[PDB]
Paper text:
Integration into host target DNA (tDNA), a hallmark of retroviral replication, is mediated by the intasome, a multimer of integrase (IN) assembled on viral DNA (vDNA) ends. Integration is mediated by the viral integrase (IN) protein, which catalyzes sequential 3′-processing and strand transfer reactions. Retroviral INs are composed of three canonical structural domains: an α-helical N-terminal domain (NTD), the catalytic core domain (CCD, which adopts an RNase H-like fold and harbors the enzyme active site), and the C-terminal domain (CTD, featuring an SH3-like β-barrel fold). Simiispumaviruses, typified by PFV, as well as δ-retroviruses that include human lymphotropic virus 1 (HTLV-1), employ four IN molecules, while α-retroviruses and β-retroviruses, the latter of which include mouse mammary tumor virus (MMTV), use eight.
During image analysis, we noted additional particles that could not be attributed to octameric STCs. Further investigation through iterative sub-classification revealed multiple interacting STCs, the structure of which was independently refined to ∼4 Å resolution. Rigid body docking supported positioning of up to three STCs, one on either side of a central nucleating complex, primarily held together through interactions mediated by flanking NTD-CCD dimers, tDNAs and CCDs, and adjacent CCDs. Because this higher-order STC assembly lacks obvious biological relevance, we will not comment on it further.
Author numbering:
A (entry chain E): 1 to 265
B (entry chain A): 1 to 264
C (entry chain F): 1 to 41, 55 to 144, 154 to 209, 217 to 264
D (entry chain B): 214 to 265
E (entry chain C): 217 to 264
F (entry chain D): 217 to 265
The structure:
DNA sequence: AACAGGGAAGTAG
DNA sequence: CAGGTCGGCCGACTGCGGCACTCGAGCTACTTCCCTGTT
DNA sequence: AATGCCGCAGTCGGCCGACCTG
DNA sequence: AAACAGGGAAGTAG
DNA sequence: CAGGTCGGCCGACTGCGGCACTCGAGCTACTTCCCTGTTT
DNA sequence: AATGCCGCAGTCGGCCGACCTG
């Protein structure tokens, strides 16, 4: 009878429920029959699978990308860099786009923040040039090229773009500023020393104060590479869509989406 | 001390938490302070409000719109007519689009589904043309125009467009069909009779036949237009985001988003 | 290991304590490394700062450099400007505040730009009061650091080299007490036994421990490492 | 029909118009749904008579 | 309609006064300040 | 009734403006610069001041 | 003065 | 009067959508409008 | 050559001091 | 005559 | 053997999302590679 | 002169009967 449903779909592309109620078969059989049909569509609505990793210390993992603030005119090319631990952000409106601009922003941000162990960015031609590669090599800082056409790879610095644009528009409507550099500096000051979180803690002091951690909870964990719920393991950090489990036997901590985290007691 | 926060926000445009934990003010006060600045941007990511009405009796309220099925060639214009109670769908492959073509589609839909009490569409030039207006007047069918640039008022027929496009693409990849009308007819047949619901009820016999009348729950209701939780009342229908409450003191059924209905 | 200190001093020219706390090098070895360099021979942070302007002939047109240094933490900043007008000092104030924060009050000199009403009203809006051995010391330090870094003539603009030198002074140039200018400005470590070399390395911050396994967290390593309790030492 | 279909006394003309299908009732009022009418109407139970 | 509204900027309950409209959980209450009406969430509105 | 609204055509926000009437998800706003009131879905209505 | 092409103008899809 | 209740207050939680390198031109279609031509 | 994110803002609810009251 | 230097086109990615 | 247990089973609920009238052109930056006049 | 809809698919969780075991 199941094979009869098979040619029924092969002729029609019925849905799962109609198969179930018309051929007296279980729901899973109908769902897999729908999945098997080559003409049946590919599921674009995928749930949360990939999570962008974050450093566990200030000055460990950074993200860098360019944007466009058309208000500045010839200073539209705004380069930004956000620390992935404390959300410490920096930017300088530099005209044009070349290795020189990236190097200057790197130096200024380095002075602003410090030495991160490695930096991840997009695949823009400037970020892939040789000169910047030996620049990072001489500075002994690892570089990650990222996946092409994947803004979610730099989702953190894109949310940073959102914050920068919001603050710039706010302070522009607030009044008038002498130089675009002045406006950018004031916005950065507000963001990194005044716009502090609900925990009563500015981004700067987190970036440069002692790291505090209460006894972290022991939570059950689901692993993607085996399809089994293995644990429990220590949970380092958590939030909205990100969790950093780390078993004892793991070489490096594993970052997983929040849908695969379960409380344990 | 609230004044200090006032000029602090006026100068820096801070967040609520900084004001609360720097000037020792209520979180409500901080939110009000960040609200009161005109220079602060307006809230753009607003939650859901407003629900498209759907006639609780079949053949009462319909929706209609056009689309662009580019693979049909000169017949690329598809007119889509869908019910709201049972989501019964009809379509045709009419080359171009004119008041005469829209009228032919209306007649075909009437033959295929029946006579609806009223039809609600977009602000397309065809549906504002007088000829259709006096045609509907002759047939005694009310009309609704909707707000321009706002497909959200036709979201039902938009989702029906999504369904029809998916089905026709599947059938196109399935095999070879003589004419676009033939393929569209096959897809409509599948969607109406074969593509059954999740409750063991084909869309065809939901469109016709007896109405399912379960004992309706006595649920608590929030009145959006008065900001007061008033109830309990009768819950007519429910689904994903939409609900129907028809209190005794109200003359007509009320369409509200589901989140404002709190079960009692 | 000392070769790493060689490139580090070549590119940054830090004091001996910096290298000795960066690579665990001997103090005398650090002194020898420093000597090998050819051209290289308040009570509460963010309370009171010092404002003054100094000139450097190498910039030529950009000698007009505003400099801000803290009384207590001695954290430093500079800006490359074409003049010393009111707007230049205002922009430097804004950028320095973004760099460093907001002090209780500011002590300046008697320059016409400092006394002008623009700076006065700008400070009044920001709720800060307005009023040189330390600043002149830093002027010597930055100019010395500018000359030390000038060895590698690859900097495209004075902003690049200035930022690199300010970075050296702030985060690389580190004191005797074991804290950088940044750490002092912004305010249970367990001894850890390495297994690659078998030597005890630290001290390092502890994350957690359990079932005979300790999640010791190295300072230089970017990620935690799980180590048995046999290779840990209380400190 | 599993559900009853009861007689309805319209108030606009004061005449017993129907009979029509009932939906719900309570508190002296019934949610009577006329076939011609596009929306349900609330009618006092004193004006609703069972039909068979 | 005479209603009670909360002066949530100061945290107190001022009134009574007229209530103009509603919607979006907001009541456009009109205090004795005839300069311009204000808006308050309905949760802080009480009929009186 | 002083209301922030959004020009739904371009998305750029025009306001503040005065509210004539509203009900059940739609708002009828009549700005002074326009000769006719604008009917807008209640998704883009904000209570200015 | 007048209307009937008719081209434009406006508007929504 | 302290048990009982209510309101203030905030941790915790959550629906939403746009950051993605930039914005636009163009066609169809009916109706309102008066020019250019004709009553 | 290495994976979406979170601020704004509304909302639930537990905490707790003041007020009702057997 | 084999080697070499702009110059250009082309491909990829933001 | 019947109380307890695991599994087969499905109602029930949720995260993502493109349906909106159709579409592109073009930007700047860098590297690799090929072409034509220049050198020994 | 009128309001975001809902299928495809994963996933919890109770329901129930074959089956382990008291
Ligand atoms: Zn040196």
């Amino acid at each position: 009878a199941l094979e009869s449903a098979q040619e029924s779909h092969a002729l029609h592309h019925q849905n799962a429920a109609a198969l179930r109620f018309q051929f007296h078969i279980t729901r899973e059989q109908a769902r897999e029959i729908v999945k098997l049909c080559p003409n049946c569509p590919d599921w674009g609505h995928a749930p949360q699978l990939g999570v962008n990793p974050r450093g566990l210390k200030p000055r460990v993992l950074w993200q860098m990308d360019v944007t466009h603030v058309s208000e500045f005119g010839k200073l539209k090319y705004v380069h930004v860099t956000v620390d992935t631990y404390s959300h410490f952000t920096f930017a300088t409106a530099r005209t044009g786009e070349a290795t020189k601009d990236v190097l200057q922003h790197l130096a200024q941000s380095f002075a602003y923040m410090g030495i991160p162990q490695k930096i991840k960015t997009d695949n823009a031609p400037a970020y892939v040039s040789r000169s910047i590669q030996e620049f990072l090599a001489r500075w002994k800082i690892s570089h990650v090229t990222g996946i092409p056409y994947n803004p979610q790879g730099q989702a953190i610095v894109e949310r940073t773009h959102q914050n920068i644009k919001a603050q710039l528009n706010k302070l522009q409507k607030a009044g008038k500023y002498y130089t675009p550099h002045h406006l950018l500096a004031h916005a950065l000051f507000v963001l990194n020393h005044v716009n502090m979180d609900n925990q009563g803690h500015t981004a700067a002091e987190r970036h440069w104060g002692p790291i505090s951690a209460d006894p972290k909870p022991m939570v059950m964990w689901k692993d993607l590479l085996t399809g089994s719920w293995k644990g429990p393991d220590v949970l380092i950090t958590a939030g909205r869509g990100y969790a950093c489990v780390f078993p004892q036997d793991a070489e490096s901590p594993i970052w997983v989406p929040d849908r695969f985290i379960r409380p344990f007691t």
